Amino acid sequence: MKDIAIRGYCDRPSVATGETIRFYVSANETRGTFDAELVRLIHGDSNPAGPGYKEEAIKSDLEGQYPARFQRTQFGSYVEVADPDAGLQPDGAFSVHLFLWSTTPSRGRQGIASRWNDERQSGWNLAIEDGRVVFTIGDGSGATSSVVSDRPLFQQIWYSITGVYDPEKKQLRLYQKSVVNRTNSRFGLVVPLDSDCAVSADATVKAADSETSLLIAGLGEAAAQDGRTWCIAHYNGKVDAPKIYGCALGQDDAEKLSRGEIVRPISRLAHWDFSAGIGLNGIPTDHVVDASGYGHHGRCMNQPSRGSTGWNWDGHEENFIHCPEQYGALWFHEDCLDDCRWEKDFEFTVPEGLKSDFYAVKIRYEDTEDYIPFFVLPPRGTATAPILVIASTLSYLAYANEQIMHKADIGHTPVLNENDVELHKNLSYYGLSTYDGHIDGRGVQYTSWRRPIMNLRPKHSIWELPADLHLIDWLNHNGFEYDVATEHDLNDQGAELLRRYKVVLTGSHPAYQTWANADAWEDYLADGGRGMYLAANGMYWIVEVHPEKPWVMEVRKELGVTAWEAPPGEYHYSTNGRRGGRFRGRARATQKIWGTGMSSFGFDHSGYFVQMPDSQDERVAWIMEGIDPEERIGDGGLVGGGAGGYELDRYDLALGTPPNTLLLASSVEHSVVYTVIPDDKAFPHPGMNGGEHPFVRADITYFSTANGGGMFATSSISWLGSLSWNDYDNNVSKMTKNVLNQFIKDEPAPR
Amino acid sequence: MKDIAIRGYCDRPSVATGETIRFYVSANETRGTFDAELVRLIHGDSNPAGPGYKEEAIKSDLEGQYPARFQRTQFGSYVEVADPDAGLQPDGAFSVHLFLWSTTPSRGRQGIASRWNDERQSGWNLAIEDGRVVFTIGDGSGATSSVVSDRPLFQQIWYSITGVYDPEKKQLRLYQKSVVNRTNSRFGLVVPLDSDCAVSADATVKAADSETSLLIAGLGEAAAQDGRTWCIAHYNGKVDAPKIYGCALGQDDAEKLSRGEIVRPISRLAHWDFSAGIGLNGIPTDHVVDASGYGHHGRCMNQPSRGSTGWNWDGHEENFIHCPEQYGALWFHEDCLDDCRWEKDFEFTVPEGLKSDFYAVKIRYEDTEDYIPFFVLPPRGTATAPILVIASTLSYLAYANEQIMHKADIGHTPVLNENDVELHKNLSYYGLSTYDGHIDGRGVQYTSWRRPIMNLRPKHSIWELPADLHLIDWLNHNGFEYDVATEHDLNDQGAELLRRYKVVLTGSHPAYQTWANADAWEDYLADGGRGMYLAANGMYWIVEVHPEKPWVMEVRKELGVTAWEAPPGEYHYSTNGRRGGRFRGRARATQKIWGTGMSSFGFDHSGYFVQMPDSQDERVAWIMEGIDPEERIGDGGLVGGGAGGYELDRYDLALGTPPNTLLLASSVEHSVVYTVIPDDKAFPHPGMNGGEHPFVRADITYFSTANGGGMFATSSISWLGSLSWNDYDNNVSKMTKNVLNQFIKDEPAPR
Amino acid sequence: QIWYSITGVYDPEKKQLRLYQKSVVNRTNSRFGLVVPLDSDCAVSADATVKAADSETSLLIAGLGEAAAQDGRTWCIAHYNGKVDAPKIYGCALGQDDAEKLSRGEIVRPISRLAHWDFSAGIGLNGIPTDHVVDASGYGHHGRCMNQPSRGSTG
Amino acid sequence: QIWYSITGVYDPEKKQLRLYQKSVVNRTNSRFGLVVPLDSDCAVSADATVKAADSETSLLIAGLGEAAAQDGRTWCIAHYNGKVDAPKIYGCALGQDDAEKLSRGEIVRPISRLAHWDFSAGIGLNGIPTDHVVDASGYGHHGRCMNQPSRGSTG
Amino acid sequence: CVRDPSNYRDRSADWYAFYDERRRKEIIDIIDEHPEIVEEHAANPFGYRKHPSPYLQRVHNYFRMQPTFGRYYIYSEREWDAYRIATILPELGDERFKTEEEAMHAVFLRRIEDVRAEL
For the N,N-dimethylformamidase alpha subunit domain, which residue ranges apply (chain E) (predicted)? Predict the structure, then answer.
């Protein structure tokens, strides 16, 4: 079919003047060259009923031909303990104990702990194959020796597994024992569970040096070429405190290990504590500590979930920073990705005479155009405009590589294209999204910029970079001079970024903010700053950018407008130790800063605004200026079919709308598809729907702040998609143009 | 209409042999005598389509005549600091600083901190009248001086307020200043809030000794007869850290007090820290510590909310046991009631020869029969029957005085009687329920036994004590010899209570349990114990009985099958510093013990069960003994007209149902009004109803445990109501009787 | 200066007072260490003739009440010198196995307690700046330090 | 023994070397306190007349590489004496406002780091019993303490 | 500035007035264009083994969520055998009823008359 043959990404989302961005490109097979050139994105939405696709080409020092090639991607979570000297390949006896929690115990061959080679069958591994636990040694001749558990594992049940090799008796052994209590495992203590065993086997071969690294939750593929060990047989579920001894262990000693007790502490070789480094600021590191004192430190790879519930967890503390001794597990999925680790193809250092706007590098392969978007900032410490436009990159990372077709293998018949069929065909090159879930049933918490985000390209509810190019095209079609920042840069710079501008606009779906973004907006509006919020669902989810990996973003979700909920002890972030669920449950609701906040949502079509009795107040005779007081504000539009639809925010004084807020209009004609969000339901009952409940509405509001500041909010997604209707001649664009011409002037906003 | 003229309560829910219960009775006016006698409750429901009301009279040392009198009820939260020596009535200058978070700031005259007499205008009070903080002193001659603030208070905004009396200038002063931040108040920092004043007035009187106690959140009514001070003008909302200084402050000094600084420490007369006492076990006491070092230790009355959010709460810690210096407030409603403090009219020691069952004292006044239900236990450490019946007392306290008619002032047009209009007519005598809310809008957390509970009475879904009398009448009609415990007693005794009995039968709606109750059930069913769960919605909420006051129950709710939701930083219980929302979110879901857990609720009628293919199984042919496999199980009942309805529990392995569980039947024919509970929802899409979603069903299950144990679950509230249909000739009583005759034998339950 | 765990039992059924002393030294807490052959444990008993009447005073740690409390003040006479760690009162007689379990730092019969004063309740990250002693059992019998004993001592 | 925040910038767009020295004394960290009128702050600049070529050595905190790394071992010659707290390399050219923000402990421009060694990452309740240095910028440029400097020193 | 809570009011109540107006017109159109749902609810007001029509269910979902739903309780004394309709200390009605299905349907008719009386 129309097969995508070229991919790419940036290392960083936003680049100011005088600093360097890199581009990492991969084709399906290593042949040929590819063209590259820089464009300026103006309007991305290629609906023929609207303005059409627009781009401006820039004569840069970036273009030319570059050799296309293929770049392999590691895909799955593990912990790589690098060992060049084969110190974790003992010669005599050795024993491996770990606590295990398998979430898919029958999905193929799954390696738990290994220092293994799989081209030649050499080394040792402790793996899950055929539903059982198998402990194997090999020497490289193709000859192995395995010991297989009598009792297979259960799904999501804690087990304490010891694997013993003993050269004196020439014998492999294996001690499985299930360690459930009232709270940790899938079912509880009322089962008559007999899943303990103690088996043994004859050893014929020795464990040879595998010439790889030790891996948790995976097997080494071949010997490490150029110091990189690939990983193959990935694992799904928790591993708690693995350890290697340099001695054979009995059954009494494995029984003592099963109760959480470090036996023979001079006979250890390694003991990775997964809860070493938990402070009062979470565990913002990808570093795993050898707790024994032999220096065999590890490194988390592709971001497994730190701060997970461990084997000794009883529900008396549910914040991992206050009981780190019961939170020593990593979750280890098989479909994680924080970085594709490709090689750089070309880099670009931004010139001096380049206007701050939305840019992309258009890459032309044989029969495929590919765009790699990035945002160019103004120079550092300056402001080349009176208007700032916040690009909602944290919600670009939320929906990043969102897979609709892959949700059918775990309304209104969703329309797909050639980008989504590559997301389904190559999961391993792209990753998942926070609206998805892993194959274990847990939602994706971590998401990343350093991967090809296939639904971020400008062409083809839209993919939310075209939905911001709506606003960009409206600003360029009028005579407005604007800058561009991102939510990562607002996180970095605080309100100091915002105070350089007379008015800061908002992207079309700003749903995932950090806590410091909310502080920056609050401190900005509290002293003189103006702002527009031309969107809905605007401060719903709390998000933290990772401190060691700033391209990685963490969210953890709960009951609300969600796709998944966090499991029952794990509501706190790894990156900082704070709660961070949704903003409303922290008493920083969206109404408290921006006037309105999330009220209802649905998926079929849109409505239109009807003028409220505050429309005829003369204090807002500047907003409702060239608009007749009997018209429908926003009937017709590119997104859904109207201006008020698909998500809505409402006026609410009980959540923190300022008392002087005026209520200008509200949206009507919403179907029974739309529903009141679960945040508002005490008892659910029928009639909690659109048209049958008074919380299904958008609300256009204005309020003034101190020192000549103000805030205008329109409370719907499709407001920006309605701006170019009827060739820019409608009530939506006239209202938005009135408020933007008022906000950029050299006088206080009215009261 | 009918006017209830006689009221009463016990001091405790349950009494064993040889120990004393005390009955506290109050009439309208002090005249005449009332009769009393002891009855045994058999069947409570007086539906003429059923068995009708049944009881048995008992000769005892109780019956006679007693002088009927009126007994006055103190109503509403406050803090009573006793002061005999008039140490907190200064002769010179004094000042009063406190923080303030008013929720109903325009509901009449509300006293905040006072040492005041309201009969003769003497003492000093800091109060709110006409929306404004008013500082008033008086001398007993009826003449008062008062200073009134310029700015009225905003609702739920934090204010620092300082009232100064200054005899050197003969001047009253008042320093009001608002202390909003991002997280503590109703609206944030973007408002241009101007609610600060420094007013002054002349002192024309002095301050005389009021001869009362110092009252936070209220005013003393009259002089302290018998050492008890009555409180009249009850304040609604938080008060954080009051203090009295023995000097006259300034404006700079009030500005320093506005920031949390304790100025002039040696000049304090009293300083109550409401957060001193918070440890890792919470704050399980009603003691208030004088942090100024003078022994003026207060006492919380009528249970205000310990562990509430203070004025300095930025939302970084949401557990009060871990940051207790930001949790120094106390909510103080006006319609709290934990204890009526009435005088004992008569007492009753249980004789040696008395069977353990449900009992009550029938009081016959002029035209009104009122009952006072209590529970007689077996002797301590023994057991007199092979069947134990658990009376669900904690979910009697949940629904205690549940005021349907009072909810309008905050389906199916609810039916009432004279017990409801007495609740509506005398709110001060009865109190509220955990489904109710306060007048502050926040739902009621603490509920109490020591008060007349009007829907505990056996006559007249039903009031949940007749719903247990359904089971008691079914047991008495057959030849089963049983004992009766309560959930308070299971809380006290542990699994040692349960292990004395072969089978243990759960009540009709056991929805509220403590954590140790579930531990005791799990340790009972794990090791040989047998049980029956004849109900739905069985282990939903977590409850903690108060340690000092074993008649008071705490619950704090959240999103789910709820009426109210806790405000953001106030999720952790005062009595034990532990999370305790729903059981399902603490990884101890109802499936993990009993086999089925909550799936859907509704409020119109009930449905019938349809047998699954596991009903034809040969292992459970003993359950389905007299039942033809083409029948409907329970089509017709005294509750909703069917055996499955009004709340439904389902089978779910992902929540912890044991794997050897056999699914016997399932309920059908549920209306569109049966919604799916908000726990099971990711995105609310239309169709979350009965007849359309696959989660609206009940599930009759059975699983066997170790040592000959087992658990039979029926997943419906109306199952006990369907027992007596067709004059005890139905499928419901045959199934219950088959499983109960199997469970009472000496052989193990079948596997 | 040697740590001991002392239980005193009164039992009206057998009409008997008992007393369980046991020394609990380890490497660091006491005056001398674990190299001594210390035999200072005992378990004695005596016959009871009288009942314990109401003394009309307050409970005192490290002292005896002098006379009955006139105007709510209880004087103190036979003062004590040295540490007392976690005192507790039960409402039941205790055996020797149960006092042995108490000696290892273990709250036996937690529904049979009457009082348990935790001298390390309220230690935060700002020290313990209070003269308040908490009844840890949950019966509300809170105490009050008088004449400032050293909080934050080694137990 | 005074604490200084120091930032050295190379800037090829202007062909300019810069250096931002600023003293960060407080009450407790330095040799003398806040009462001194300490003036030891500078923002100087000069012209870049060469480029930076690959030295073919290792990166050395507290020293200079002697010659090119024969056999993978780099010899260190000009040994520094005294504390170094949290070095970092940025892949861009900073300013004076940005060096002022770095002077306060803020990690400015996190996505532009090339390496950032936290010398305190690894401290647990067992101390820091290792000579590993963690690259806190997420690039695997993990150092290695040689000849045992004093871990757990005052920052 | 914002300095007095009497100058400010919940402006959402403007939209509640507009919403209640359009919702009342919708409901009386549904009742006048479907007059068999009254007979339907008279036959079986609980829906016991015969679930309501979507239009009857829509009229229920309008009635069962208004702030005026707090009127019209059904009262029944313990030593009485009839049902009366309380009205908001309530005011008891005068018309006795044998069964409570009759009382619930009379409350349904009286609510339809009340929603007609406001238009």
Answer: 15-116
